[PDB]
Design a binder for this molecule. Structure first.
Ligand SMILES: *[C@@H]1O[C@H](CO)[C@@H](O[C@@H]2O[C@H](CO)[C@@H](O[C@@H]3O[C@H](CO)[C@@H](O)[C@H](O)[C@@H]3O)[C@H](O)[C@H]2NC(C)=O)[C@H](O)[C@H]1NC(C)=O
Ligand SMILES: *[C@@H]1O[C@H](CO)[C@@H](O[C@@H]2O[C@H](CO)[C@@H](O[C@@H]3O[C@H](CO)[C@@H](O)[C@H](O)[C@@H]3O)[C@H](O)[C@H]2NC(C)=O)[C@H](O)[C@H]1NC(C)=O
Ligand SMILES: *[C@@H]1O[C@H](CO)[C@@H](O[C@@H]2O[C@H](CO)[C@@H](O[C@@H]3O[C@H](CO)[C@@H](O)[C@H](O)[C@@H]3O)[C@H](O)[C@H]2NC(C)=O)[C@H](O)[C@H]1NC(C)=O
Ligand SMILES: *[C@@H]1O[C@H](CO)[C@@H](O[C@@H]2O[C@H](CO)[C@@H](O[C@@H]3O[C@H](CO)[C@@H](O)[C@H](O)[C@@H]3O)[C@H](O)[C@H]2NC(C)=O)[C@H](O)[C@H]1NC(C)=O
Ligand SMILES: *[C@@H]1O[C@H](CO)[C@@H](O[C@@H]2O[C@H](CO)[C@@H](O[C@@H]3O[C@H](CO)[C@@H](O)[C@H](O)[C@@H]3O)[C@H](O)[C@H]2NC(C)=O)[C@H](O)[C@H]1NC(C)=O
Ligand SMILES: *[C@@H]1O[C@H](CO)[C@@H](O)[C@H](O)[C@H]1NC(C)=O
Ligand SMILES: *[C@@H]1O[C@H](CO)[C@@H](O)[C@H](O)[C@H]1NC(C)=O
Ligand SMILES: *[C@@H]1O[C@H](CO)[C@@H](O)[C@H](O)[C@H]1NC(C)=O
Ligand SMILES: *[C@@H]1O[C@H](CO)[C@@H](O)[C@H](O)[C@H]1NC(C)=O
Ligand SMILES: *[C@@H]1O[C@H](CO)[C@@H](O)[C@H](O)[C@H]1NC(C)=O
Lengths: 411, 66, 98, 49, 49, 48
């Protein structure tokens, strides 16, 4: 019969980092294999459709990286812009909103942009969206999330005061609205302070951005490996075609070029296979990120430990190279008291039960409270419902439940 | 021509490469055909292929107040 | 022939500690141990606050607490029987190993 | 070429095990550490624990 | 205008099973290909990375 | 023979009242309305 109920909470700003798109990369497979040698380029025709198929595969990846980036960020019809006057009831977003003194990146997006970090047919294509357009979208998503809550996901964005939006996110974790407005000063200070600590977390060490830096590193590693493989001998007399073409008669130069074609093509196939698999991982990470956008940013998810480790309030996206950073604002309880509890209470020979919350006392007089923040109330016919005779409830206890109509004995 | 400079080939050098046959425009619109690095093209006003910097939809100042 | 297997980082004893901890949290403390600080709450009251989470009013649980407990315990019995009776349940894991 | 084929098979399989592990981790986070309201995510029925 | 409302329920414990890890595997690519033959080991270097 | 409100997952018939029901609009617009006699939990107290 014991329950511990929290008397107090902390807001937290648990950060989460997701990759969203590789470097869009393509290889002219004929320039990679043959370097304009006409003899080689002709021998590569005997191998048939592989070269075309590899370019189809890399092009599929390349278009898909813009799609992945579009699915994550393009979740809004209009580019919402913040009001001039930052009247958000104490919440200080000035680190996460655009710093117009510059590309309209926010301060925290600049830390992320700072902390992160041949041509044998190899080419890198640009992204469709510039990193400035991504910062416009993350500003839009954020400006909607501040000014209009979830409503800008569900069609038309509606203004609402930010403290009121927070009270209607507190109600989304069963903490009653008054536990926000009566603590508004303190919640504002906690959120502002937590945003402060994020800047130290990102500035102090590079090891936070490990996920994004792995994706950058793996691409650079695979490309450097793919280029170094051109120098690999593969059982030829040399890895330089001009040696073979000058040192040998055409029939022998062909048989030797065939070893190089085989080795280089087998390397290119190995690379494209790694990239299709790696791009499948990034697609799964992008569909996850797109969902955290749709649930945590555009909404308030009731999925425990989906939108960061706590009871979820809201989230803010911040753009990052090849990725996205979420600042999941989560409620977390932090001080608690033991109380004696009972499943129901019995009065006038009938069981009574709390409409919302739990029954408690510190071993003396019975109170109801909501179950995520201690707020003892006198138990009444109105915070409770009847459920028949006193007997069958295991561990019920007695009280006199108050009748709010009792004083009204005038007529 | 992706990645090249137009010297090496109406004409408009872009961040994506040398573009030929498209008229540059200073207005902006939703992306009709994507090109790269924020550039998009459309068939438009007597009519010809234009190319422009993408608009991410229209802007909106939400009428927020306390 | 140059093939090798490495051990998992966590020992099966450590896995059994984690599944025990997860479970002991789940029993004693509801969701609270996921949302940061694990708080005790009595198990009958935790189940009322899971019936209330599927649109069934709390009294339906306490007024049936013995019947519910018997159905629950009995179902756990049928798990031990079902899992002892056939290897066809663990198809996925044996397939991964195979 | 057999070694490359084997590593390829194992990569593709390891991606299926990763997808299954993220799902397991999600069922741990929602079905164990909470009560998912996602109909027939946590077994066939309304979900308790 | 007809509705069916349940008068009674069953708890029902349903098993679900998910894999989480393959067996951690590693291959000495040179020992596998060449079986300690020095003459083989030198030829494998030509195939590069 | 008797009209009841009940929770939608378990038959728990309750007498219909001002407390377990909320009012909206007027009698005419709802395609499916029935007659009834909704009980007032203050009425026995008004008898004092
Ligand atoms: C719930 O938790 C919060 C955070 O732990 C408590 O908020 C505030 O905490 C600080 C200490 O961390 C209290 O100390 C005072 O801070 C001011 C500066 O703000 C300083 O000038 C004083 O010298 C002193 O250090 C602060 O009083 C406290 N805020 C309030 C509203 O009292 C909060 O008290 C906790 N609530 C409960 C009921 O436990
Ligand atoms: C233990 O829990 C009980 C009930 O759950 C708390 O009850 C306290 O009861 C008294 C009398 O009903 C309330 O009135 C105030 O009492 C103090 C001390 O007698 C007196 O100085 C005041 O003039 C006034 O009469 C009191 O407000 C109420 N407390 C609360 C939180 O509502 C009790 O405080 C808890 N602690 C202990 C050690 O009993
Ligand atoms: C909660 O409060 C109620 C009302 O005060 C308590 O119920 C009363 O309990 C006493 C025993 O403590 C009953 O007395 C016994 O009654 C039986 C009747 O068969 C008789 O055979 C015994 O010789 C003895 O007289 C009393 O009848 C009963 N009254 C009512 C109105 O129910 C109850 O015990 C309190 N505590 C709990 C945890 O329920
Ligand atoms: C809801 O369904 C349950 C069964 O799923 C009903 O509770 C009772 O369950 C037990 C165990 O399965 C039934 O078996 C036995 O009955 C004999 C007497 O016939 C008794 O000697 C045994 O000890 C054992 O308890 C029992 O028949 C069944 N009771 C009834 C009336 O069916 C439960 O009643 C159902 N709820 C409602 C409101 O109908
Ligand atoms: C539920 O009960 C009410 C009350 O009986 C029904 O509403 C209307 O009740 C009156 C008297 O029983 C019916 O008679 C007609 O009344 C009108 C004036 O309102 C008068 O002009 C006629 O000469 C005649 O006396 C009236 O027909 C009836 N309304 C309708 C639309 O039939 C009500 O009908 C009952 N609910 C349902 C779903 O039928
Ligand atoms: C609750 O009471 C028990 C009494 O033994 C104690 O061990 C426990 O630490 C207390 N918990 C809190 C949160 O005060
Ligand atoms: C545990 O609590 C119940 C009421 O919930 C009480 O009747 C019982 O005596 C306590 N347990 C023991 C072993 O005393
Ligand atoms: C293009 O190439 C010409 C070569 O004369 C050079 O002058 C010019 O700066 C180049 N422009 C760009 C944008 O590369
Ligand atoms: C577009 O803007 C530039 C710079 O302001 C200007 O030189 C150019 O003439 C403009 N072109 C058109 C078609 O408006
Ligand atoms: C169904 O119920 C409505 C209730 O007003 C009635 O008007 C209608 O005639 C009935 N229709 C059938 C097909 O039962």
């Amino acid at each position: 019969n014991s329950i511990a109920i929290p008397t107090n909470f902390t807001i937290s700003v648990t950060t989460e980092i997701l990759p969203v798109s590789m470097t869009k990369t393509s290889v002219d497979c004929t320039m990679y294999i043959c370097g304009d040698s006409t003899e080689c380029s002709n021998l590569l025709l005997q191998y048939g459709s592989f070269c075309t198929q590899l370019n189809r595969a890399l092009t599929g990846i390349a278009v898909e990286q813009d799609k992945n980036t579009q699915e994550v960020f393009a979740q809004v019809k209009q580019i919402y812009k913040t009001p001039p006057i930052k009247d958000f009831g104490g919440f200080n977003f000035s680190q996460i909103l655009p710093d117009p003194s510059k590309s309209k990146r926010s301060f925290i997006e600049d830390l992320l942009f700072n902390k992160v970090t041949k041509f044998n047919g190899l080419t890198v294509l640009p992204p469709l969206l510039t990193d400035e357009m991504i910062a416009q979208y993350t500003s839009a998503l954020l400006a909607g999330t501040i000014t209009s809550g979830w409503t800008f996901g569900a069609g038309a964005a509606l203004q609402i005061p930010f403290a009121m939006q927070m009270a209607y996110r507190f109600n989304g974790i069963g903490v009653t609205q008054n536990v926000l407005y009566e603590n508004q000063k303190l919640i504002a200070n906690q959120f502002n302070s937590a945003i402060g600590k994020i800047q130290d977390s990102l500035s102090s060490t590079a090891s936070a951005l490990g996920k994004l830096q792995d994706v950058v590193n793996q691409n650079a590693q695979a490309l450097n490996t793919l280029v170094k493989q051109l120098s690999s001998n593969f059982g030829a007399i040399s890895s330089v075609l001009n040696d073979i073409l000058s040192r040998l008669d055409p029939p022998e130069a062909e048989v030797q070029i065939d070893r190089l074609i085989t080795g280089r093509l087998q390397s290119l196939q190995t690379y494209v296979t790694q990239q299709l698999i790696r791009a499948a991982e990034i697609r799964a990470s992008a569909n996850l990120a797109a969902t955290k956008m749709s649930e945590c940013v555009l909404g308030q998810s009731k999925r425990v430990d989906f939108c960061g480790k706590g009871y979820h309030l809201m989230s803010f996206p911040q753009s990052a190279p090849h990725g996205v950073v979420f600042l999941h604002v989560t409620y977390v309880p932090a001080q608690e008291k033991n109380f004696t509890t009972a499943p129901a209470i019995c009065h006038d020979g009938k069981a009574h039960f709390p409409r919302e919350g739990v029954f408690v006392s510190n071993g003396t007089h019975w109170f109801v409270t909501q179950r995520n923040f201690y707020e003892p109330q006198i138990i009444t016919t109105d915070n409770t419902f009847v459920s028949g005779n006193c007997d069958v409830v295991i561990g019920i206890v007695n009280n006199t439940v108050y009748d709010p109509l009792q004083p009204e004995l005038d007529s | 021509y992706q990645d090249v400079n137009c010297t090496e080939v109406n004409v408009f050098q872009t961040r994506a490469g040398c573009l030929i046959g498209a008229e540059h425009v200073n207005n902006s619109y939703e992306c009709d055909i994507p090109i790269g690095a924020g550039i998009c093209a459309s068939y438009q006003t007597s009519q010809s292929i234009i190319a422009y910097t993408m608009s991410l939809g229209a802007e909106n100042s939400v009428a927020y107040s306390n």
